[PDB]
Design a protein around this motif. Structure first.
Motif, PDB file in Angstrom:
ATOM      1  N   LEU A  28       1.054  -1.087   0.384  1.00  0.00           N
ATOM      2  CA  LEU A  28       0.061   0.038   0.559  1.00  0.00           C
ATOM      3  C   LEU A  28       0.973   0.815  -0.045  1.00  0.00           C
ATOM      4  N   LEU A  30       0.774   5.040  -0.394  1.00  0.00           N
ATOM      5  CA  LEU A  30      -0.168   6.323  -0.828  1.00  0.00           C
ATOM      6  C   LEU A  30       1.063   7.569  -1.255  1.00  0.00           C
ATOM      7  N   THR A  32       0.427  12.354  -1.293  1.00  0.00           N
ATOM      8  CA  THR A  32       0.361  13.250  -1.595  1.00  0.00           C
ATOM      9  C   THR A  32       1.043  14.710  -1.742  1.00  0.00           C
ATOM     10  N   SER A  34       1.647  18.358  -3.076  1.00  0.00           N
ATOM     11  CA  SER A  34       0.971  19.779  -3.052  1.00  0.00           C
ATOM     12  C   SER A  34       1.066  20.532  -4.592  1.00  0.00           C
ATOM     13  N   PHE A  40       3.958  14.529   1.398  1.00  0.00           N
ATOM     14  CA  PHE A  40       3.522  13.216   1.963  1.00  0.00           C
ATOM     15  C   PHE A  40       3.780  11.856   1.668  1.00  0.00           C
ATOM     16  N   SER A  42       4.163   7.681   1.783  1.00  0.00           N
ATOM     17  CA  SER A  42       3.524   6.628   2.950  1.00  0.00           C
ATOM     18  C   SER A  42       3.657   4.808   1.899  1.00  0.00           C
ATOM     19  N   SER A  43       4.521   4.343   2.778  1.00  0.00           N
ATOM     20  CA  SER A  43       3.695   2.764   2.264  1.00  0.00           C
ATOM     21  C   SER A  43       4.136   1.636   3.617  1.00  0.00           C
ATOM     22  N   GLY A  44       3.424   0.771   3.083  1.00  0.00           N
ATOM     23  CA  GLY A  44       3.121  -0.844   4.287  1.00  0.00           C
ATOM     24  C   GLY A  44       3.104  -1.262   3.647  1.00  0.00           C
ATOM     25  N   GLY A  55       5.944  -0.631   8.130  1.00  0.00           N
ATOM     26  CA  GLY A  55       5.268   0.570   7.270  1.00  0.00           C
ATOM     27  C   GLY A  55       6.572   1.820   7.560  1.00  0.00           C
ATOM     28  N   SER A  56       6.170   2.977   6.882  1.00  0.00           N
ATOM     29  CA  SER A  56       7.315   3.937   6.806  1.00  0.00           C
ATOM     30  C   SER A  56       6.553   5.305   6.720  1.00  0.00           C
ATOM     31  N   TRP A  74      10.036   8.458   9.147  1.00  0.00           N
ATOM     32  CA  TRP A  74       9.683   7.444  10.275  1.00  0.00           C
ATOM     33  C   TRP A  74       9.519   5.769  10.140  1.00  0.00           C
ATOM     34  N   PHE A 280      -1.483   4.625  -4.952  1.00  0.00           N
ATOM     35  CA  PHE A 280      -1.994   6.333  -4.680  1.00  0.00           C
ATOM     36  C   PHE A 280      -1.607   7.507  -4.876  1.00  0.00           C
ATOM     37  N   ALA A 282      -1.886  11.958  -5.071  1.00  0.00           N
ATOM     38  CA  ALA A 282      -2.617  12.794  -5.270  1.00  0.00           C
ATOM     39  C   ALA A 282      -2.306  13.181  -6.221  1.00  0.00           C
TER      40      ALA A 282
END
Ligand SMILES: CCCCCCCCCCCCCC(=O)OC[C@H](COP(=O)([O-])OCC[N+](C)(C)C)OC(=O)CCCCCCCCCCCCC
Ligand SMILES: CCCCCCCCCCCCCC(=O)OC[C@H](COP(=O)([O-])OCC[N+](C)(C)C)OC(=O)CCCCCCCCCCCCC
Ligand SMILES: CCCCCCCCCCCCCC(=O)OC[C@H](COP(=O)([O-])OCC[N+](C)(C)C)OC(=O)CCCCCCCCCCCCC
Lengths: 282, 282
Positions: A28, A30, A32, A34, A40, A42-44, A55-56, A74, A280, A282
């Motif tokens: 997963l 994600l 985003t 701008s 931002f 994130s990976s899971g 996760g990160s 993180w 995903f 954005a």
């Protein structure tokens, strides 16, 4: 042209083998970004055999007015990370990164300074790793001449006071074709051809072998963009592995991936592995 | 006994109707947790009716030495969110929550303070919403007496300077049986019976009706735990809707849910709603 960094020699060919596949994982991703502000990521990742979930998250701000990037990372091991980057600021093509890591659990501190200079025909870098383990210095140079590329890469571990890495690469690079060869540590030999065969097909052949052993490993891979929304990957290697991958854009910036790895044996057991990815933007 | 909060009156019955179903969603959740330390969830959700694909991360740290929880949420739509909770810290049964929301993309800030006090026979709360729109204050009180439960709930919107919510509930609660009734705003009447019929079967009946309309809505639902790995839900209502839901643990920490919502009408015109949920737990 400005040549790639040493690490990026052979990257395209590497990408035909690695992107589009995630066997044994549910992934997963994600993103985003701008147009004017925060980014931002994130990976899971669940490993479907160990039931491990990784996760990160990463928060990155570009102050494009002062060539600055600030990043915060993180992960799931409670490892924290900050990175500041200056690019093009003291001189065109100069890039300076300070990178610090902290682990609240273990109290492991790490810091790194990475410096890079690039310009027409030349790409240099020098990474310094500050450590209790021991400082090390990684240096790299890539020279380019009419499509040809020649690079040298080393690592110096200060505690052992010895070069522990000495790599050479030679290659030839166009926008439709790439030849890459390298020997690591007078020991590991590699070669690759990458071909952008048309608007819809990429192919790659990889070779690897090792001093003192007569065997050779190879892989053949392809990627076929069926239309702008669907993408098929297939690869085989001479260990008898077949990888298949399928990527479908469901909606703009959302893609779903299925992948299967199959072995050269029975299929009535725990052989062929599966994977699923959703991405995903954005 | 310590009674439930006002919001949790009737929860069990509500659960039989709501859990185990996700019609018109494809859901993917990857979670990892630690007794001491972090808990982490990344989520992805596609609504198959709106074509809308949503993504979330959440980080929870419980410092159960100081009665603290910190929670951090992030989604695709740029919303960020933090929640700090103190429990049992100033006094037994006292709970204080500080809640903040932020939008890097909208600039939209929301802040909330929620306070709760509970003890033998009494559960009282007071939520303050500090909104641009205008502060509102929600208060609630639940009294219990020998299995019986009586509660009052109100909301005050400071911009209109008037109570905009006034709810009463009366109920009876055992661990295998629950009766719940309520009237919202002298207007909406509801009632429910919940039964834990055995180790494997839960059942619920719900009723609802509205002052000035003579009609009544009702639903019947069940939840049958086939074995510890498989779970079936079925529900019907008097709008002619049939919901079915099936939850299977495929491997420890991997759970798959399928669900179908069916109208009482032709099945060859595109009216049925399907759903799929996959949870991965470390
Ligand atoms: C050399 C080494 C010592 O020599 P000894 O083993 O005779 O032996 C070896 O193992 C490797 C020898 C190096 C062979 C030179 C490779 C030519 C580049 C072709 C790569 C093309 C990639 C697409
Ligand atoms: C208004 C009218 C009566 O309400 P009035 O009493 O303002 O609307 C109503 O039908 C309220 C009817 C009240 C029936 C039982 C509810 C009282 C709850 C028991 C005590 C609550 C303790 C928290
Ligand atoms: C009073 C209202 C208006 O009077 P007007 O419309 O004659 O009308 C009403 O709703 C009166 C509702 C009062 C009867 C409440 C009986 C509670 C049964 C709930 C049991 C729930 C378990 C499933």
């Amino acid at each position: 042209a400005v040549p790639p960094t040493y690490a990026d020699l052979g990257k395209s060919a590497r990408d035909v083998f690695t992107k589009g596949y995630g066997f044994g994982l549910i992934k997963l991703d994600l993103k985003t970004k701008s147009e004017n502000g925060l980014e931002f990521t994130s990976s899971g990742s669940a490993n479907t055999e160990t039931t491990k979930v990784t996760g990160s998250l990463e928060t990155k701000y570009r102050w494009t007015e002062y060539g600055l990037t600030f990043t915060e990372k993180w992960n799931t091991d409670n490892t924290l990370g900050t990175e500041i980057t200056v690019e093009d600021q003291l001189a065109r093509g100069l890039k300076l990164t300070f990178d610090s890591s902290f682990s609240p659990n273990t109290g492991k501190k790490n810091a790194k300074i990475k410096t890079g200079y690039k310009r027409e025909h030349i790409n240099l870098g020098c990474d310094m790793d500050f450590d209790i383990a021991g400082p090390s210095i990684r240096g790299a140079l890539v020279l380019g001449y009419e499509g040809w590329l020649a690079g040298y890469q080393m690592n110096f571990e200060t505690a052992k006071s010895r070069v522990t890495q000495s790599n050479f690469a030679v290659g030839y690079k166009t926008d439709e074709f790439q030849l890459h060869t390298n020997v690591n540590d007078g020991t590991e030999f590699g070669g690759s051809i990458y071909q952008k065969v048309n608007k819809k097909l990429e192919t790659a052949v990889n070779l690897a072998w090792t001093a003192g052993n007569s065997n050779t490993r190879f892989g053949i891979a392809a990627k076929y963009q069926i239309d702008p929304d669907a993408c098929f990957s297939a690869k085989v290697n001479n260990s008898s592995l077949i990888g298949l991958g399928y990527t479908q854009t469901l909606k703009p910036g959302i893609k779903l991936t299925l992948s299967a790895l199959l072995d050269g044996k029975n299929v009535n057991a725990g052989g062929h592995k599966l994977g699923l990815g959703l991405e995903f933007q954005a």
